[model samples]
Target: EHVILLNAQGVPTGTLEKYAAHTADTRLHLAFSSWLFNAKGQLLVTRRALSKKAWPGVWTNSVAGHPQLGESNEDAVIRRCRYELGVEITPPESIYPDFRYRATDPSGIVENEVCPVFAARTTSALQINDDEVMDYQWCDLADVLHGIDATPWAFSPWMVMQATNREARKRLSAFTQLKL
Candidate 1:
């Protein structure tokens, strides 16, 4: 897969193979992070596959992906949910449109991206892909936030970044509380 490279203005400049894009020094790219909620309002958190080049074995957001050229971010979210988690979900609703972050993994690989965040509801059973995820858990949003706040290092930096944003956190809190 190729990810869209971005300029300082967050404009797409070109593309790079997903594997080659992240290194000790990574350039800005377009990516996404999504929080999935079940009908009962529990958040789904997944542990990255142990074999992943970056952030292996760490818990992170429900689903995330790099948008393929010509693909919209919403579609990328849906695509990753199906491909990685084997679940169907409602269309993604953007929660943090201007969210962006840069963080280095323990191994020194860097993730630098203009990653808009999203939220969605799912009512399907999971049939996860082993190569991308090794484990998952469903938890209350408040508990997840508390966990992230007290021990931010236990989760992906981007996940912590998104949750700490006051507006984004409000949307996230309200979204899950919806009766849907």
Candidate 2:
């Protein structure tokens, strides 16, 4: 658990110390997201299970969850994937490092988080874990952009910015070709 802090832009702000706490409510939170691409180049997205405390029922990236204290980012990604998504992912060599985001309603509730973005590819058949996700979809990156723009959602602000950035897009093309 983390003590939630937001930047001037209303994005999350957290430190390693705050992230290590196990509070059920705010302090600091650290997590990672998986960008799992299928053979057709579509990204897997999940509709979070209704039981989730935060952002329940929202469509988000493939898999994401908090890292335990004293855990390395890679290990957390692997552990969370199995615990939440039912797969074992070989860690990618290059991760997107830490990006932060915050959720603050106009009325002043805040949920701040810091996340590492890791990319991996798997042609192996998936065994969906129904407990953490209600449903799944494979969509082209373009569709992800459109849907987020078309709805009221809980997307990470950095994700939105990086996904659409021209340089980022160019790098993604090259990045996708490197095997995990």
Candidate 3:
């Protein structure tokens, strides 16, 4: 898959192959990060695979990926959940639509992404594909939020940023009350 490159105003600039897009000098691109929830009201989080190019072995939000050219951000979130976590998810709910971030991994690979935040729910038990995720946890959103605030480095920068967003927190917390 390829990533849709974006300018500062979130306009499409061009496209680049996914594996080739991230580097020491990366261009801004469109990406989506999503939190997943099970029927029991717990949020799902995952650890980046040790083989990942960036943030290897880091615990992060449930699903995240770049939207390919011509694809919608919501579709990208759904697709990544299936490919990464092996579960079918509800249509993604937008949490922080204007959220974006740029962070450098320890390897010097950078992520400068216009990453819209989303949340989804799944009834299917996860069967993780280790290429994208190495570990996972199902926990209270408050606990996750607390952990992020207490130990931000243990999570993806985007994940921490998204959780700290006011509306994003409210919308995500709403899921905890749902019967899904």
Candidate 4:
């Protein structure tokens, strides 16, 4: 484990805090996620591979990944969109700067990814990343809500928030109207 910090604009400041082992002091980090919804208002979800370190083989938002040491969150989202799903998008602005927190699992093997979730409109076609993602599918809002209400299918509580938060809904609705 290690400590990673960034500059004012979330850019890496290059001062590593290497850890001989994990600590309680939360590891600071940043990530980018895109929410791709189709014309029918269904969300695009990816099933991660079982070999992944965390949340393997479970469905998740459109695309997500860590930002390089110096890259901006927007750039990170764009990069992952191409790398994971073979799509390009200009995500709705409402999704940026969204804050959600989660800690490691009970085993300490799975942990932090402070993802800035963004949303975009797509034509419903996707190319799954065979290594990182095992499969892909689309689901309506009710389906996600029902899944969560019945059982937590997400990696963390925030995944639930990202899907159902009021602000997120408004942003998604706006994007729908704008045909983004």
What TM-score quantifies how close candidate 3 is to the native fold? 0.96
Q: Give each prediction's root-mean-square deviation over alpha carbons.
A: 1.1, 5.4, 1.0, 4.3
lDDT of 1 by residue, 66-161 (tens): 999999999999999999999999888889999988989999999998999999998699999999999999999999999998999889888898
Residue-level lDDT tens digits of model 4 in 1-180 = 233354445545453433322244444556566777777677777777776655666676677766665567777777777787877665445474656455564445534445677887775357667877888777775676578678774544556667667777667556444243
Poorly placed runs, candidate 2 (over 4 Å): 1-25, 93-95, 105-110, 150-180
lDDT values for all models = 0.91, 0.60, 0.90, 0.63
Model 1, residue 124: what's the lDDT?
92
Error of 1 at 78 (Å): 0.5
Query: Which of the two, 1 or 3, has more lDDT?
Result: 1
The digit string of per-residue lDDT tens for model 2 on 1-180 reads 433344455345544443333234454466666677666666777777775656666677777766655567677777667777776655543455545556653333344566657766655666777778888887776677777677635564445644555654454454344343
Using lDDT, give the best candidate's number.
1
In the predicted model 2, the residue pairs found to clash are: 2-26, 2-27, 2-28, 3-26, 3-27, 3-28, 12-101, 12-102
Give the CA lDDT, 0 to 100, for residue 18 in model 3: 90
Residue 58 of candidate 2: its Cα lDDT? 61
**Residue pairs in steric clash, candidate 1?**
none
Q: What is the lDDT of residue 139 in candidate 3?
A: 93
Better of 3 and 4 by lDDT: 3
List model 3 lDDT by residue over 130-177, tens digit each. Answer: 998999999999999999989998887878888988999999998887
